[PDB]
Amino acid sequence: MRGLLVGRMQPFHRGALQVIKSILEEVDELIICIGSAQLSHSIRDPFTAGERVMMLTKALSENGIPASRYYIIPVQDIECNALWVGHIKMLTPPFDRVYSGNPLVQRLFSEDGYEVTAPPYSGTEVRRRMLDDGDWRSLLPESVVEVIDEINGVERIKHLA
Amino acid sequence: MRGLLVGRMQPFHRGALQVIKSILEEVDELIICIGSAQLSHSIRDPFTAGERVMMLTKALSENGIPASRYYIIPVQDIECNALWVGHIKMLTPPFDRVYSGNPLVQRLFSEDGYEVTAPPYSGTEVRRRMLDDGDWRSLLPESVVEVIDEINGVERIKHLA
Amino acid sequence: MRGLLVGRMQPFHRGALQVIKSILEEVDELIICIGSAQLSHSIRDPFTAGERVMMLTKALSENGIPASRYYIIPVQDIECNALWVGHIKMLTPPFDRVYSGNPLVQRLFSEDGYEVTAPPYSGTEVRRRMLDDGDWRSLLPESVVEVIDEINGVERIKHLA
Amino acid sequence: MRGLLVGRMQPFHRGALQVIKSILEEVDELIICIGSAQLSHSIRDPFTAGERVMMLTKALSENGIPASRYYIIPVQDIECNALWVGHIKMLTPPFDRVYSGNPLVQRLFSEDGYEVTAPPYSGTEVRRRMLDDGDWRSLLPESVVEVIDEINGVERIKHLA
Amino acid sequence: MRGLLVGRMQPFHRGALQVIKSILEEVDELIICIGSAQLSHSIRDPFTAGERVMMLTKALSENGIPASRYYIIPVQDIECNALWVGHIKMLTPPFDRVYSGNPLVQRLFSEDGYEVTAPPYSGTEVRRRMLDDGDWRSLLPESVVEVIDEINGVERIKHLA
Amino acid sequence: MRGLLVGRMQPFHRGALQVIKSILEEVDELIICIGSAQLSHSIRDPFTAGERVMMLTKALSENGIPASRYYIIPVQDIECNALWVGHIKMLTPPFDRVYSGNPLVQRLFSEDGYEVTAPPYSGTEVRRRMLDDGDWRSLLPESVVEVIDEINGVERIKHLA
Numbered sequence: 001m002r003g004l005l006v007g008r009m010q011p012f013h014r015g016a017l018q019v020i021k022s023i024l025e026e027v028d029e030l031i032i033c034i035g036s037a038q039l040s041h042s043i044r045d046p047f048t049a050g051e052r053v054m055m056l057t058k059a060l061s062e063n064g065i066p067a068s069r070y071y072i073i074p075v076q077d078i079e080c081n082a083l084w085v086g087h088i089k090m091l092t093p094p095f096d097r098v099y100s101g102n103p104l105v106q107r108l109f110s111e112d113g114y115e116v117t118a119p120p121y122s123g124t125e126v127r128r129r130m131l132d133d134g135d136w137r138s139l140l141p142e143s144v145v146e147v148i149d150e151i152n153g154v155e156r157i158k159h160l161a
Numbered sequence: 162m163r164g165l166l167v168g169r170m171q172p173f174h175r176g177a178l179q180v181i182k183s184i185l186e187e188v189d190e191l192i193i194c195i196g197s198a199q200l201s202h203s204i205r206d207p208f209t210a211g212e213r214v215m216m217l218t219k220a221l222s223e224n225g226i227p228a229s230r231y232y233i234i235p236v237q238d239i240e241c242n243a244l245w246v247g248h249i250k251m252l253t254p255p256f257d258r259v260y261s262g263n264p265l266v267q268r269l270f271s272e273d274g275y276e277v278t279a280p281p282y283s284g285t286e287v288r289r290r291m292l293d294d295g296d297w298r299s300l301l302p303e304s305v306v307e308v309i310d311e312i313n314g315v316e317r318i319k320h321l322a
Numbered sequence: 323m324r325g326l327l328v329g330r331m332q333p334f335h336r337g338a339l340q341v342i343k344s345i346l347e348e349v350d351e352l353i354i355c356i357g358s359a360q361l362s363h364s365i366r367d368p369f370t371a372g373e374r375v376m377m378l379t380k381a382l383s384e385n386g387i388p389a390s391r392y393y394i395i396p397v398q399d400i401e402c403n404a405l406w407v408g409h410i411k412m413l414t415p416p417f418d419r420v421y422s423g424n425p426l427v428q429r430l431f432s433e434d435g436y437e438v439t440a441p442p443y444s445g446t447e448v449r450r451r452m453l454d455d456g457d458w459r460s461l462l463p464e465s466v467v468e469v470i471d472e473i474n475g476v477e478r479i480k481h482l483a
Numbered sequence: 484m485r486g487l488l489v490g491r492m493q494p495f496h497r498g499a500l501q502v503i504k505s506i507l508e509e510v511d512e513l514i515i516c517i518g519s520a521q522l523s524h525s526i527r528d529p530f531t532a533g534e535r536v537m538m539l540t541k542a543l544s545e546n547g548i549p550a551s552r553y554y555i556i557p558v559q560d561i562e563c564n565a566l567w568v569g570h571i572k573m574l575t576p577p578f579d580r581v582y583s584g585n586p587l588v589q590r591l592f593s594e595d596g597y598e599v600t601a602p603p604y605s606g607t608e609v610r611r612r613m614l615d616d617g618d619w620r621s622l623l624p625e626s627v628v629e630v631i632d633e634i635n636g637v638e639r640i641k642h643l644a
Numbered sequence: 645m646r647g648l649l650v651g652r653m654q655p656f657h658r659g660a661l662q663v664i665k666s667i668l669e670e671v672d673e674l675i676i677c678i679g680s681a682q683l684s685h686s687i688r689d690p691f692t693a694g695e696r697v698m699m700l701t702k703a704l705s706e707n708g709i710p711a712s713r714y715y716i717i718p719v720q721d722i723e724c725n726a727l728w729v730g731h732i733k734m735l736t737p738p739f740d741r742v743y744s745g746n747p748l749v750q751r752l753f754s755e756d757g758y759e760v761t762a763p764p765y766s767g768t769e770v771r772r773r774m775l776d777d778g779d780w781r782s783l784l785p786e787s788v789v790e791v792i793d794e795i796n797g798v799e800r801i802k803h804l805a
Numbered sequence: 806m807r808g809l810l811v812g813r814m815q816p817f818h819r820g821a822l823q824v825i826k827s828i829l830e831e832v833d834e835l836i837i838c839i840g841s842a843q844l845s846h847s848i849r850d851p852f853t854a855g856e857r858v859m860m861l862t863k864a865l866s867e868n869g870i871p872a873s874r875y876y877i878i879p880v881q882d883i884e885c886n887a888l889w890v891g892h893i894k895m896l897t898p899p900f901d902r903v904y905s906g907n908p909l910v911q912r913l914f915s916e917d918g919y920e921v922t923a924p925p926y927s928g929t930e931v932r933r934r935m936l937d938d939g940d941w942r943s944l945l946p947e948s949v950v951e952v953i954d955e956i957n958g959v960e961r962i963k964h965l966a
């Protein structure tokens with residue numbers, strides 16, 4: 001019983017961590033696809049796929065979730081939405097259910113015959129607070145804040161803006 | 162102390178498993194990049210990236226190596242060799258040493274300033290035995306043989322040939 | 323005497339059908355290129371190229387226009403506008419005149435030395451009525467409405483929105 | 484009842500025409516996909532997709548097959564074999580059976596759940612005779628020979644060689 | 645001592661010429677990269693890379709700057725910002741300093757370890773005056789105005805708009 | 806009166822230099838396109854486009870040819886031969902004649918309506934001597950040998966082999 005979740009994780013926030021835990025209550029393993037793995041250094045997508053892999057890895061580990069319970073797979077975007085589901089399939093282990101609140105992701109997997117569950121704190125809010133010197137830290141697990149400090153994430157986002 | 166190993170894993174054999182174990186003796190974690198993640202269904206590259214993720218995952222787990230000791234990241238190839246190292250960096254956590262016996266991989270990482278260690282049983286031999294009805298099973302961990310049977314790998318390779 | 327018309331046909335409406343008929347009065351055959359053949363499942367481009375081929379095919383046939391009078395060729399977009407005309411040429415039979423009301427299409431073919439005729443009811447209006455439950459059906463040939471019902475087009479566009 | 488046939492048609496020969504006729508005995512319409520639509524001016528792929536569309540169009544028409552019985556759709560190749568079937572689907576009307584003698588095409592459609600029928604005179608032979616001044620004309624329908632003369636096909640292939 | 649400057653040059657204006665001269669006071673040679681070399685015929689990017697090469701070439705020559713003092717290299721954009729610096733490196737001679745006022749360009753080269761100097765009259769203003777019949781000519785070197793007249797640049801931009 | 810020459814220049818040899826000089830006797834300026842600008846670090850294409858720009862630049866300068874007499878423009882390859890000529894046009898200043906001994910290049914430009922002149926010492930021979938420790942230096946201008954030593958070209962080619 002393997003589920004699949006897709007998200008840009010720009011950056012990985014508390015809400016996403018919560019949803020991952022709830023998901024792990026109903027499936028044995030979870031494939032966590034980091035979408036738009038090719039985008040970085042922009043206002044909407046500040047971090048590279050590798051940096052996000054670290055954010056997810058450190059955060060899940062720090063929250064006690066065993067590494068054997070999930071797969072972290074960066075997935076580049078493609079121009080043709082009609083092939084994106086096949087694109088994901090080709091890069092991942094088999095899965096039974098898909099979790100997403102993204103209308104496009106839901107519709108594509110749904111048309112493909114997959115059971116789509118929408119999940120029961122938004123990157124936008126987080127990146128906006130980093131830019132306006134608001135309180136972004138409280139919206140993220142401490143392990144993630146730590147990675148962002150280590151890679152100079154705020155310094156990057158501010159210079160880009 | 163994180164190392165990086167790159168290979169097509171078509172399919173993941175005993176020799177590669179042995180090398181992974183030896184590598185894990187000198188580094189804390191190992192990033193295992195599955196190269197040519199975009200190629201599948203050909204004589205040289207029979208399996209999709211997702212199928213190889215399963216082969217690696219099951220095999221490492223079955224050999225007792227904890228999931229927290231490694232990262233499995235499928236990496237698509239790119240046309241420009243000159244950017245491939247940056248391509249890998251962008252998709253992965255930071256690493257200190259690179260392990261490879263592939264001249265091209267060694268040279269590219271070397272020119273980039275990385276310390277390249279060549280590893281102390283070849284996909285070609287394995288795929289050739291699958292095609293000629295030779296003894297391919299003995300060259301692979303049993304968990305891998307199991308995945309290949311589950312996905313009808315031999316049936317696929319024979320029809321393609 | 324072969325003409326060429328390019329359009330996204332998202333979806334194929336009454337106005338476009340009318341223009342096609344008028345065009346067929348002055349040329350023997352018409353090459354109908356379905357532009358942006360790679361885009362689907364978005365607000366501006368709901369339908370795949372194949373679905374649009376069906377919309378065009380059924381509609382022209384239903385309006386009595388013989389199949390031998392035209393060619394339906396899906397054309398993917400390319401990043402470089404400067405090569406798009408050559409792109410179209412490479413995928414199509416030879417043509418003498420180009421019909422379009424799209425400034426970009428007119429300018430590109432014009433710079434290439436082609437005679438461009440602007441045609442003597444807009445996808446946008448159609449898709450907006452599908453979304454707002456307005457009267458979209460009356461803007462389209464009945465064969466097209468039929469295809470949209472068969473492929474659940476409205477259900478798709480609403481979920482995406 | 485719609486079938487699908489895929490081929491490079493470099494150039495369209497007598498054997499392929501024969502197979503198309505036999506296929507049209509068991510299905511109402513046939514989607515004829517011209518594969519490798521992006522390749523031209525090489526020894527293995529001399530002609531552009533548009534030139535092949537003309538070869539097919541003229542030949543089928545000349546052999547009395549009504550235009551309403553088929554669809555000619557040029558299809559560009561893609562790097563990932565795993566997505567090629569979805570690629571074809573996205574560009575075409577729905578189909579029930581697939582006809583091919585190409586192992587790769589058969590395997591891909593088969594894995595996708597499609598019924599694949601292998602067809603009951605080879606481009607290679609044709610192009611080899613064009614190059615060695617052998618008898619290529621007899622291997623092709625006269626309408627095709629005519630198109631090749633009109634576009635200077637032999638002159639092209641010889642200069643390239 | 646070689647510097648590097650990157651810009652779209654849509655079109656090459658007086659301000660950019662001034663900056664190039666000042667730059668040539670502190671470095672022996674200057675690599676001038678024409679960014680977005682693949683974009684043309686749009687409101688933001690009217691001219692092809694080749695047309696811009698002519699604008700730069702004629703203007704620098706006309707202002708007395710010796711050809712041996714610079715390199716004009718058109719550079720296509722790429723999707724992954726993380727590899728763009730390596731992309732530039734691969735296409736150019738070695739350079740010691742980078743000059744730019746573009747935050748993204750500055751940040752990318754900075755993260756790569758390069759010394760970035762922001763330069764001590766904007767394409768947007770120029771293109772806006774061409775469209776509104778304002779005074780665009782005075783914002784450009786006369787050699788550039790001449791190239792634009794020769795290629796019918798204004799006629800193009802107006803038709804596109 | 807501007808001519809155009811295309812070559813991979815892997816590496817730039819004496820014969821190519823000779824041809825460039827002869828060409829400069831019949832045209833005012835010469836556009837020298839470095840083909841396959843995206844390929845590097847392989848047996849057939851050892852050097853990056855930037856390294857080749859240096860080889861050409863230094864060699865022409867050293868042979869007394871004024872920089873104002875030519876343009877060095879790296880050109881990436883594209884999959885569709887049918888668009889390659891338009892690709893070159895888009896990246897370059899206008900030209901009147903094309904010089905090449907490459908059948909494909911000759912045929913493509915010829916079909917496009919261009920006057921193609923075949924030129925009145927082969928990279929292959931040069932790279933083979935670098936690999937077999939033969940006498941490669943004598944086949945190249947000294948400025949080129951110098952660049953190769955500076956970038957460790959032989960060390961690279963040998964490791965790759």
Ligand SMILES: NC(=O)c1ccc[n+]([C@@H]2O[C@H](COP(=O)(O)O)[C@@H](O)[C@H]2O)c1
Pocket residue numbers: 006007008009034035036037076077078079080081084102104105
């Ligand atoms: N490449 C595609 O065609 C395509 C289609 C749907 C979703 N996606 C990706 O799914 C991810 C979903 O991200 P979020 O819901 O966090 O925005 C994004 O990275 C998005 O780009 C990709």
Ligand SMILES: NC(=O)c1ccc[n+]([C@@H]2O[C@H](COP(=O)(O)O)[C@@H](O)[C@H]2O)c1
Pocket residue numbers: 167168169170195196197198237238239240241242245263265266
């Ligand atoms: N895309 C590239 O330019 C490039 C350069 C070097 C190696 N690779 C990849 O590294 C992997 C190494 O594989 P093996 O040593 O098992 O063959 C392959 O997947 C290869 O394609 C990619």
Ligand SMILES: NC(=O)c1ccc[n+]([C@@H]2O[C@H](COP(=O)(O)O)[C@@H](O)[C@H]2O)c1
Pocket residue numbers: 328329330331356357358359398399400401402403406424426427
């Ligand atoms: N790929 C390109 O560079 C390019 C240039 C001009 C037009 N087109 C296509 O032409 C079609 C024209 O569509 P409409 O006029 O219906 O919008 C579109 O599909 C558009 O994308 C493509």
Ligand SMILES: NC(=O)c1ccc[n+]([C@@H]2O[C@H](COP(=O)(O)O)[C@@H](O)[C@H]2O)c1
Pocket residue numbers: 489490491492517518519520559560561562563564567585587588
């Ligand atoms: N782009 C792909 O991944 C892919 C996979 C299988 C077949 N094809 C195409 O199918 C066609 C079959 O051609 P023939 O059997 O005549 O060779 C070819 O154009 C081939 O390139 C494409």
Ligand SMILES: NC(=O)c1ccc[n+]([C@@H]2O[C@H](COP(=O)(O)O)[C@@H](O)[C@H]2O)c1
Pocket residue numbers: 650651652653678679680681720721722723724725728746748749
């Ligand atoms: N392709 C990329 O990822 C990327 C990243 C940064 C800048 N660029 C280019 O740098 C150039 C800078 O142009 P300007 O500062 O004149 O706008 C542009 O052509 C821009 O597209 C490219």
Ligand SMILES: NC(=O)c1ccc[n+]([C@@H]2O[C@H](COP(=O)(O)O)[C@@H](O)[C@H]2O)c1
Pocket residue numbers: 811812813814839840841842881882883884885886889907909910
């Ligand atoms: N990208 C293409 O479709 C295409 C077509 C013809 C030639 N070329 C290039 O022209 C150059 C000619 O090189 P040489 O004659 O030295 O081999 C090469 O870089 C070749 O790749 C590119």
